[PDB]
Amino acid sequence: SWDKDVYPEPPRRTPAPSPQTSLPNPITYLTKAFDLLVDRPVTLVREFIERQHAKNKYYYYHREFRRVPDITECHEKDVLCMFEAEMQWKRDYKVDQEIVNIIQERLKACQQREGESHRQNCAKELQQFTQVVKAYQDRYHDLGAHYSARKCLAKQKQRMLAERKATKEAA
Template sequence: MPADYDKGAYPEPPRQTPVVDKQTALPNPALILSKLFYYSVDLPVTTFRDAVDSIRAKNKIVYYHQKFRRVPDLTECKEGDYPCYYEAEMQWRRDYKVDQEIVKVIQERLRACQQREGHSYQQNCAKEIQQFNEVTKNFQSRYGDLGAYASARKCLMKQKERMMAAQAQNA
């Protein structure tokens, strides 16, 4: 409200918060405990975290380029070595995701070239088309027909069957 309003016509509204009616001269124990907690626990922890965050802000680590060490393949695991089986399975899943992303990137490059070149893309994007066909053929030969529950073991069996079929064809 402006400072020069008519106080008779517009009286001040009543206050919403009631006046504290102190019954005792003793301090409030909840207030004492909250202040004690704040100064003994919260303030030091917050100050330490802020100091650590300021140091980490200078030395940012890029987490999306995490590098995992290569682990042995399923063929190199000894019989009954379940941790080795698990690590090989996780390695296969990471490789599968990387191969999927490679196919997506090559596909995006091909689409961008087709968009850029228009009707003459067959001629001008021959290199991208050939690269896309090669990548999809390799992806299909490795991961195709594995189904929804693909695993390193299924992929290994598919590779073994493909090698046996090629060997029988050569013989």
Template sequence: MPQDYDKDAYPEPPRQTPVVDKQTALPNPALILSKLFYYSVDLPVTTFRGIIEGIQGDKKSHYYHQNFRRVSELTECQEGDYICYYEAEMQWRRDYKVDQEIVKVIQERLRACQQREGPSYTQNCSKELQQFNQVSKCFQSRYGDLGAYASSRKCLMKQKERMMAEAQNA
């Protein structure tokens, strides 16, 4: 600062940070609980995990992606094989979620193209629009009108009814 500044308008800053006056002599309970959690739970778990990872070496397992083997579908299950029914149902639910995500990704691509192109998106985004129409039509034909309690059995019955209707019309 220059030497000729107005000392009333701009007082000189303090030389040291002032010490906060404590209102009580009791320790902070949040600090005590966080230290207690750290030393009783966090530290032993992290130490144990570090030891295990050191033993495993190069064989690191990744927890972010799980691969499921494909199992037989509901039509291939033997009558009364409840384990097969359950596995087919779980596979159907995974496929349903994957198909939902595919529709979301295609829809996001279409929206991004619409945002980028503006009013002329119908002409410039025709490929994305056609792809979205195809994907949404397939999703609707497979999963549409199943209701809130959708299951692989309901989906199979819907597919059977659709095939019978096509056979009658042909």
């Protein structure tokens, strides 16, 4: 399985055929042939593997963390503080990359399930895609290659200062 919380799926809508023919039905003959040929021993191999690993078990977990406080709660030098701040920041950056990955995967799914109803029931998912990617363009984009953490925060002050003065004069 997986988490349908994070990976939503639409309700299944399967139509039913209706012959109205006397061929009679070659493709049903062949799909029953495929199931009764391939599907039995592969399921039995699955059963064998399940039991033989169901003798004894292992366990893997998810690595969870604490929270080191801030970068603006570190001073001008503070190597034993800035290090914690940057590593926490860079791990946030990596998991945000995978956030954008998952949203793009949802967009691919929306293109594929709709077929040629492109402009219906993909406004929601493409719209939230544009929202998160507007956020990502604003926040993590125009910083270049050698990001440390401080270039991000200088960008942060630059952006909010410029938009503050622009909405100040245009208020």
